[PDB]
Enzyme design. Structure first.
Site, PDB file in Angstrom:
ATOM      1  N   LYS A 282      37.395  39.168  43.976  1.00 45.63           N
ATOM      2  CA  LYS A 282      37.373  37.772  43.266  1.00 45.63           C
ATOM      3  C   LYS A 282      36.920  37.343  45.417  1.00 45.63           C
ATOM      4  O   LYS A 282      37.050  37.960  45.601  1.00 45.63           O
ATOM      5  CB  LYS A 282      39.160  37.748  43.972  1.00 45.63           C
ATOM      6  CG  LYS A 282      39.358  36.172  43.948  1.00 45.63           C
ATOM      7  CD  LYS A 282      41.036  36.001  43.704  1.00 45.63           C
ATOM      8  CE  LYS A 282      40.862  34.748  44.275  1.00 45.63           C
ATOM      9  NZ  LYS A 282      42.466  34.158  44.558  1.00 45.63           N
TER      10      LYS A 282
HETATM   11  N1  LIG Z   1      38.259  33.078  37.419  1.00 40.64           N
HETATM   12  C1  LIG Z   1      37.226  33.533  37.990  1.00 40.64           C
HETATM   13  N2  LIG Z   1      37.322  33.267  39.474  1.00 40.64           N
HETATM   14  C2  LIG Z   1      36.989  34.040  40.683  1.00 40.64           C
HETATM   15  C3  LIG Z   1      36.070  35.089  40.295  1.00 40.64           C
HETATM   16  N3  LIG Z   1      35.370  35.705  41.383  1.00 40.64           N
HETATM   17  C4  LIG Z   1      36.439  34.695  42.214  1.00 40.64           C
HETATM   18  N4  LIG Z   1      37.284  33.798  41.315  1.00 40.64           N
HETATM   19  C5  LIG Z   1      37.268  32.995  42.703  1.00 40.64           C
HETATM   20  O1  LIG Z   1      38.925  32.922  42.545  1.00 40.64           O
HETATM   21  C6  LIG Z   1      39.155  31.604  42.382  1.00 40.64           C
HETATM   22  C7  LIG Z   1      40.825  31.991  41.594  1.00 40.64           C
HETATM   23  O2  LIG Z   1      41.766  30.795  42.003  1.00 40.64           O
HETATM   24  P1  LIG Z   1      42.595  30.684  43.213  1.00 40.64           P
HETATM   25  O3  LIG Z   1      43.224  31.947  43.263  1.00 40.64           O
HETATM   26  O4  LIG Z   1      43.514  29.229  43.387  1.00 40.64           O
HETATM   27  O5  LIG Z   1      41.934  30.637  44.364  1.00 40.64           O
HETATM   28  P2  LIG Z   1      41.058  29.496  44.800  1.00 40.64           P
HETATM   29  O6  LIG Z   1      40.831  28.660  44.574  1.00 40.64           O
HETATM   30  O7  LIG Z   1      39.880  30.069  46.257  1.00 40.64           O
HETATM   31  O8  LIG Z   1      42.099  28.845  46.447  1.00 40.64           O
HETATM   32  P3  LIG Z   1      42.924  29.027  47.180  1.00 40.64           P
HETATM   33  O9  LIG Z   1      44.029  30.905  47.343  1.00 40.64           O
HETATM   34  O10 LIG Z   1      44.266  27.932  47.990  1.00 40.64           O
HETATM   35  O11 LIG Z   1      42.120  29.482  48.586  1.00 40.64           O
HETATM   36  C8  LIG Z   1      38.809  30.957  41.130  1.00 40.64           C
HETATM   37  O12 LIG Z   1      38.568  29.728  40.874  1.00 40.64           O
HETATM   38  C9  LIG Z   1      36.945  31.674  41.282  1.00 40.64           C
HETATM   39  O13 LIG Z   1      36.760  30.667  42.278  1.00 40.64           O
HETATM   40  C10 LIG Z   1      35.985  35.671  39.017  1.00 40.64           C
HETATM   41  O14 LIG Z   1      35.253  36.032  38.254  1.00 40.64           O
HETATM   42  N5  LIG Z   1      36.172  34.690  38.029  1.00 40.64           N
END
Ligand SMILES: Nc1nc2c(ncn2[C@@H]2O[C@H](COP(=O)(O)OP(=O)(O)OP(=O)(O)O)[C@@H](O)[C@H]2O)c(=O)[nH]1
Length: 317
Positions: free
Chosen positions: A72
């Protein structure tokens, strides 16, 4: 002209300067993306999935169905959209709150500008100290709706279009592709995860269905996993005696949930972690004026309690 306003994004100690697209220009780029994406949702959103935390109930499904896995990436989520506005060929990145910036490359092939919607993360390359844009998936490539096909077809379409693209030093981001590894490959997964973490800031892993079409919004079959129990919550200080509260977005009223040991300024937002029954202060957030909502809190508690780890998860395979 496209009415822009300048903006700087800071990520991982580095900053990018970008033209934020404003007013009617913003409105038209967004409305264009909504049509190409054929999203008739009555609320503005990116044509892309938001992951759900993995729960122990999901372990069955993970073992029946086919899935891929990746790191991620920790950076900003952006949908990247190639289109033409007022005759000019435009590359834009849009974020989750529907804010539009231009991100121009020298060498994008003109086919992309007939309507490409690729999904990704703007993020920083640790090794190179340059920004990278990492493409996760595609929705529409050169006017062809790829969203209902399976993941490998979407990547085939995306990679085809960009096959003749080369980055040049003055480009504002290094375009790169998410390498998705099959969930039955644990040793290959671990190795990919080790290489990935040499280059990027990661926040665990993402597990995605190999064959479902693109979901827009919360995708209950896209799972994220945070390493360990490092979930945090932002609370609002409701008392100088550290009574922390969490926001109820439909009462629009903060609700008392706990109490911290220390002196605190009422109305601030504190980022806390849970340890041994109580929430503990990590840092005050001067940049926020609002706590996390109940939903986020309820779900984080469940995740804290369940204590799924990456090694538990990768040992199911
Ligand atoms: N859908 C998706 N998201 C990914 C991927 N790699 C990284 N991400 C990120 O992981 C996020 C997941 O949402 P959350 O778990 O809420 O994480 P966040 O938006 O960083 O928010 P916080 O947890 O508050 O820091 C996505 O919105 C992407 O920005 C991927 O392969 N797919």
């Amino acid at each position: 002209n496209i009415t822009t306003e300048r903006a700087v994004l800071t990520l991982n100690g580095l900053q990018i300067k970008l033209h934020k697209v404003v007013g009617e220009s913003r409105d038209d780029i967004v409305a264009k993306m909504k049509d190409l994406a054929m999203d008739d949702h009555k609320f503005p959103r990116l044509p892309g999935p938001n992951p759900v935390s993995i729960e122990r109930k999901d372990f069955e499904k993970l073992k029946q169905n086919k899935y891929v896995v990746s790191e991620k990436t920790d950076g900003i989520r952006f949908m990247m959209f190639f289109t033409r506005v007022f005759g000019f060929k435009v590359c834009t990145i849009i974020d989750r709150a529907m804010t539009v910036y231009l991100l121009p490359f020298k060498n994008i092939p003109r086919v992309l500008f007939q309507g490409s919607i690729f999904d990704g993360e703007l993020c920083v390359d640790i090794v190179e100290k340059k920004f990278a844009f990492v493409l996760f998936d595609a929705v529409v490539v050169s006017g062809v709706t790829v969203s209902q096909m399976d993941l490998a077809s979407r990547f085939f379409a995306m990679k085809r279009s960009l096959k003749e693209f080369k980055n040049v030093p003055e480009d504002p981001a290094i375009l790169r592709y998410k390498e998705w590894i099959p969930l039955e490959h644990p040793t290959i997964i671990k190795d990919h995860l080790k290489k990935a973490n040499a280059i990027y800031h990661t926040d665990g892993l993402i597990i995605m269905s190999v064959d479902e079409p693109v979901i827009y919004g919360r995708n209950f079959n896209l799972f994220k996993l945070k390493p360990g129990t490092h979930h945090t919550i932002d609370f609002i200080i409701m008392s100088e005696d550290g009574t922390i509260g969490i926001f109820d977005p439909n009462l629009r009223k903060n609700v008392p949930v706990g109490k911290l040991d220390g002196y605190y300024n009422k109305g601030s937002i504190v980022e806390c972690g849970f340890a041994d029954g109580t929430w503990k202060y990590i840092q005050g957030r001067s940049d926020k004026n609002q706590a996390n909502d109940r939903l986020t809190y309820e779900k984080t508690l469940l995740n804290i309690e369940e204590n799924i780890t990456i090694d538990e998860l990768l040992d199911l395979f």
